[PDB]
Design an enzyme around this catalytic site. Structure first.
Site, PDB file in Angstrom:
ATOM      1  CE  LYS E 155      -3.279  -1.619   1.949  1.00  0.00           C
ATOM      2  NZ  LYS E 155      -4.565  -1.857   2.671  1.00  0.00           N
ATOM      3  CG  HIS E 274      -8.508 -10.426  -3.511  1.00  0.00           C
ATOM      4  ND1 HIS E 274      -9.713  -9.771  -3.377  1.00  0.00           N
ATOM      5  CD2 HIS E 274      -7.680  -9.876  -2.588  1.00  0.00           C
ATOM      6  CE1 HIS E 274      -9.624  -8.869  -2.414  1.00  0.00           C
ATOM      7  NE2 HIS E 274      -8.397  -8.915  -1.923  1.00  0.00           N
ATOM      8  N   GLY E 356      -6.604  -6.036   8.784  1.00  0.00           N
ATOM      9  CA  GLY E 356      -6.258  -5.346  10.013  1.00  0.00           C
ATOM     10  C   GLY E 356      -5.569  -6.122  11.119  1.00  0.00           C
TER      11      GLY E 356
HETATM   12 MG   LIG Z   1      -6.632  -5.703  -0.797  1.00  0.00          MG
END
Ligand SMILES: [Mg+2]
Ligand SMILES: [Mg+2]
Ligand SMILES: [Mg+2]
Lengths: 123, 438, 438, 139, 438, 123
Positions: E155, E274, E356
């Protein structure tokens, strides 16, 4: 008529053809980054200081381009001394490594600077 | 005039807008001339045809929406024409030029005509691939930052054997230049067939790269007589694993160029574009197409580098340099920018300055073009008294000297010469160059 | 000047000769200007380079061997330059233009420059395929003899649906026209995708052919953004079994054109060439390239038809028409033919006369072009009061009336109108046309 | 909320606009819910990462620019979100759906979520072929 | 109701069985609702048709064989339906879903409908390839044993240049993580084209592998707009010799996924799946399809990894984790397993826990998933105060600490925190992480 | 802020990021295998302690994964001391080799364990 040397004349891109930078001119280059709002960061390499091709040979692929990051980019740095201090700490820990200063332009979203700041003895 | 001169028309964000420099025949008023340009470049028929009633021609017509006199010129006006998005084939520069410029220039009511600028709407921009790589990616691939790139054209262009050519290539690169280049004329000829040239240039560039440790490239010219021959040359470059190929986009053509641009994207090859033949079209102020139009077209078709002249009118050049590199350029008549142009993230193109330049022009070139440019030194390297390598060293040192000085806050415009002379005191190669050229 | 102005040079039969119209900057003498043109278009380097000593540059240099003042022009000369055979890539028009015209036009010592003519030596001519078919083969394939061929451009160019377009095609052909045509701008756009157009035009032309019994064709435009897209269009035309395709050679480019020309030869397709964008380059007398140069280039790259203007300066046109059709054309300055040109049996190209012509121009066109030409009537057919078919009939009748009259010994120049009026007495379609146009 | 709820934002003609029917969990105000939808469908990270400083994230973030209550429904609002043109792959419906709808529907602060409409900007529309033929050609 | 509610029916081992959670409209009894679900998802016609007499429809009809009320829910039942083997295309998940779920969900007599589970008979299971490799082969190929694998999502997902992206990749891997990953949204966009990303990520992963001596991988996202584009991306990954590629199976689709799965088997590439868009379908308890159904479908179509949520309802998750990894899973309503499922040696799929998570969740994750799982730490690595490498070291150390403790007999549930704190005493990297996150 | 080392930081998968195992914790790991009914076996390598690519470069292919077996898997082993005894004998014969303990799960029909037990001086 001088003949350009063949042996041990490896170079490190921008500014590598000029005499080694003194702490003063080194500080001036860092000031250039700061004044342009570019983020300074240090990179070091002990094994392969130059580009080579081991893992692949297709166009645009070369190994040895990525060096390893010394800590993290110095976001919010306001003083060139901060950077030169890290250079000193890096050298202390890796006196055998090539160390270069790079800069990131978050606005252009790319790395925009790269000049050698330290070379091991004999380079 | 009634159907085509529409001064009340508000342009659509999807319209292609053209700024024509119109020189009407004596006796032909502005409005009629402008209306003529619009009609002749879109619908317009010398005689009424019944088929027109099967469509709504107002949806397809070109419209001259604005006209303004040219300062200090006898009977010359800038006419603005809008073309609807639907007239153009997606991703085809060939069709864009055919539609706008394929017919009007021969209209008898005009004594001359020049296309100055085009506003390419973003909806049409998104239909093109654009540069295979672009400025940022190229710098990341080559790992070169904070300074203009340096190149050298090998000469003589014709006459050297492929091996002697490669020898010159190695000596140039090992001295500090990033690229060497094939002349635009160098394709495949009796004394040097293309494959032999590609092969020896590859041996030379790999040796120079191994010696210096810096990535090197040689613009291998793939321009050819047919699409098939052009592709064969690009394919061998891919096989050799080299980084960059070249194409004369105007003499080869837009159809062949787009094909090459797509292949380069799919194969990771950088593409250097030479503008051979441009002056046949963009030189005279009264008739033709300004280079800025040819530059926009290349950014759409695709190319990573494009020759842009040497400068050392300045403002006009800087104007189209912005159009090649930036994502958005606002209208600016003082620089020949007639329309605001947006590129919606289409990569920028590296401008290449070339033409009789040498060490003494370095401060000026660095100052004017900045870091994102390629400075080409043919005779400026191969004409150094000590040879190609020291010639390359002199250019690399001169450039780095200027970059360091600029970075330290020195004014390149005020103290350029001082900066160079200072460097000669420690660089024999540069000192020798300075003795020969100023 | 010393190396490049060689007034004593005797040209070789293998040399490519160029006739440039040079306008030097004030203060630059003829000899130096001519020498500049030769150097700048061949070897020549702003600075001395050591590599020149590895070759014999006299073997590769261009030579200005002759200069002559231009009558009635201020400071303008015609300079003749010879280029050795070895400088060029075999079969590549792209390389021929890059070498001769890729650089000189921007030389600062010149205020303007125009390439007027090129003498292509037979040894270089033999390296090109030339027209896929040529005049004689085309006539034999279509089985049409003793008269000019007739065509019609479908309009509006943009706006009609593919089916409505095909409807116009059928009505035109059934009336007596041999061909219908896609406008140069018509490639593939939102309201009419190419494949749909090819398909309906095929249904229309086959119906017209079945009805009349005469072979019909429609120039299906294959011009596209990439070589791949262009080839896809040509391939579908082959699949449909139709006789002719089209290409905008200047906007598409020479590299793509040669590819298309080769495919057409290998697949038996006739190739119609449109010269869109030519006036951007060949219009001004002082700068650019004369159309005759662009015509020679097309004959080498390949094409069976090529647009050549309408005439109704005459002599200049007739001059390049001879260059397109004949096997040998002697030097003739009164017609702009600067060099004697031989083609060693390379097929001739059919010139296409187009542009606002109608029935009344028929005697003049037949007289000037002769049998080997294609007369295109867009609005001249689609603007007839009774529709496309009667519009076609009027044109076919008018033409045949002129042909018969000529064959009977009547002077088309003296009695053209009489010949047409005589035909209106028995052809209502023609009578109606004559009422609308004169 | 600060970065993603932008009621003053004027949409660009190149933006992809989404109208979401948001049903927040009890206790979660409209503005925060809308901001959550925008963040969760674009940038947004549960923890701060140093890499964000190498780019200008405002150029890539989704923005909840408008919110309006749903008539006759208990705790339900229509939130408008704008996505910049650069987030999408040309001609790819697969990527368009992945970016807008690939993640948000599972956000815990929401009890439910429905995509009602999308404004596809013309610059993105031109990157698709569309129907092979279409109504007129078929007829 | 008569034809479709068959409470006496004994299922065949070749039948596909479906467990639907039916919420009838008020006034519609259970039996009729269940009969409606069976009819609407198989034969069933609103009006009688004569063609039905040409076949034996009882051989093709779906049968609601059992119904049971849902505890604590207003008017909701679980209806069991059996579909004969002959209704389905071999090896096609696309056809399996179309037949069972393509029509019923819109039946007006129902207010809502959710598919909870499917019993795939072994005769149908044998018609699919299943995972290209599977748990055991993947561990053998990568040479990693006795611990969960570790990954990290790079990210920001959008915004970094391909090179800056690769830089983050190298720093993450060299610290001890096994994999780095492309976000599901990262395909090919303006600021980062796919090929450039693949190329730099390859340089980064090879450097990290060379440095540490442990095999590394980066899930290169091949999801694309067409099958052709997807294949082009997979092919380049093969050319680079890298170990793993990625696909968003729901947004790309089952047809494209199966194609990719087959190519991966034929080329030795591991495939990471995914589940982007799953919550649009599997979130609400009353309508949609439970994730376990989507998980079974992926195991058939093919994938080596599949995202399965984070847990830290537990039992439901552990239930479908067993369905993804094991060869046989017995019916167990307490874990949402409505049917006993056998896989006849079809390889298991590695579940990927992500969302998370950070160092403090390590004992819980190791305990719940066990060794055969992939733990993904995006912000949990890139958010470490010292950078990516130390962030990776903290995660690797924390994991190994937990593994060793578990192996020594320590209870991860009782003493997880103690185990982590103990490790901070000798790992500065971990100590620093623990200071930031708890 | 510490910078993760670049030189001589080669790793050996599972448990290699923890401090070297003592004979006691080493015995505990072996007990874990036995308690699970997994068969312990020893592997050693003197030439290439890490993965590399010499003979091929296709996806999933790497050299250096296979080490060489010390004797045979210890089927029927009931005491961790047996295993540690072999470790000692192996070390005696190959003090220059990397030695690792692996385990086989005959039920799952695959190798299931692998952790470094000995490294030569300086590793
Ligand atoms: Mg992702
Ligand atoms: Mg040149
Ligand atoms: Mg036309």
């Amino acid at each position: 008529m001088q003949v350009w040397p063949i042996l041990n004349l490896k170079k490190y891109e921008t500014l590598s053809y000029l005499p080694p930078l003194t702490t003063d001119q080194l500080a001036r280059q860092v000031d250039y980054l700061l004044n342009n709002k570019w983020v300074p960061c240090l990179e070091f390499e002990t094994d392969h200081g130059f580009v080579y091709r081991e893992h692949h040979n297709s166009p645009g692929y070369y190994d040895g381009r990525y060096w390893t990051m010394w800590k993290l980019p110095m976001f919010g740095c306001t003083d060139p001394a901060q950077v030169l201090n890290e250079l000193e700490e890096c050298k202390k820990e890796y006196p055998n490594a090539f160390i270069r200063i790079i800069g990131f332009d978050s606005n252009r979203e790319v790395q925009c600077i790269s000049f050698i700041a330290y070379k091991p003895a004999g380079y | 005039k009634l159907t085509y001169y529409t001064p009340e028309y508000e342009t659509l964000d999807t319209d292609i807008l053209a700024a024509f420099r119109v020189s009407p025949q004596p006796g032909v008023p502005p409005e009629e001339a402008g209306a003529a340009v619009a009609a002749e470049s879109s619908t317009g028929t010398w005689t009424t045809v019944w088929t027109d009633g099967l469509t709504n021609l107002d949806r397809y017509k070109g419209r001259c929406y604005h006209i303004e006199p040219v300062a200090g010129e006898e009977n010359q006006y800038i006419c603005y024409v809008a073309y609807p998005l639907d007239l153009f084939e997606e991703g085809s520069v060939t069709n864009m030029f055919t539609s706008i410029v394929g017919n009007v220039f021969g209209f008898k009511a005009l004594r001359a005509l020049r296309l100055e600028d085009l506003r390419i709407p973003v909806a049409y921009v998104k239909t093109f691939q654009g540069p295979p790589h672009g400025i940022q990616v190229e710098r990341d691939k080559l790992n070169k930052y904070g300074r203009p790139l340096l190149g050298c054209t090998i000469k003589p262009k014709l006459g050297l054997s492929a091996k002697n050519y490669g020898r010159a290539v190695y000596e140039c690169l090992r001295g500090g230049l990033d690229f060497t280049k094939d002349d635009e004329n160098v394709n495949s000829q009796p004394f040097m067939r293309w494959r032999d040239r590609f092969l020896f240039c590859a041996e030379a560039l790999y040796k120079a790269q191994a010696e210096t440790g810096e990535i090197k490239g040689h613009y291998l010219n793939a321009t050819a007589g047919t699409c098939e021959d052009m592709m064969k040359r690009a394919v061998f470059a891919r096989e050799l694993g080299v980084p960059i190929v070249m194409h004369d986009y105007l003499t080869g053509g837009f159809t062949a160029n787009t094909t090459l641009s797509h292949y380069c994207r799919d194969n990771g090859l950088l593409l250097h574009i030479h503008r051979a033949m441009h002056a046949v079209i963009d030189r005279q102020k009264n008739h033709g197409m300004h280079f800025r139009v040819l530059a926009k077209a290349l950014r759409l078709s695709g190319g990573d580098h494009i020759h842009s002249g040497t400068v050392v009118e300045r403002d006009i050049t800087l104007g189209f340099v912005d159009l090649l590199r930036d994502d958005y350029t606002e209208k600016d008549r003082s620089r020949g920018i007639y329309f605001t142009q947006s590129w919606v993230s289409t990569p920028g193109v590296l401008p290449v300055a070339s033409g009789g330049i040498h060490v003494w022009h370095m401060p000026a070139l660095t100052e004017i073009f900045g870091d994102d440019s390629v400075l080409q030194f043919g005779g400026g390297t191969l004409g150094h008294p000590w040879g190609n390598a020291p010639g390359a060293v002199a250019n690399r040192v001169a450039l780095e000297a200027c970059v360091q000085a600029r970075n330290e806050g020195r004014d390149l415009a005020r103290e350029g010469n001082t900066i160079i002379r200072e460097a000669t005191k420690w660089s024999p190669e540069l000192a020798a160059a300075c003795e020969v050229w100023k």
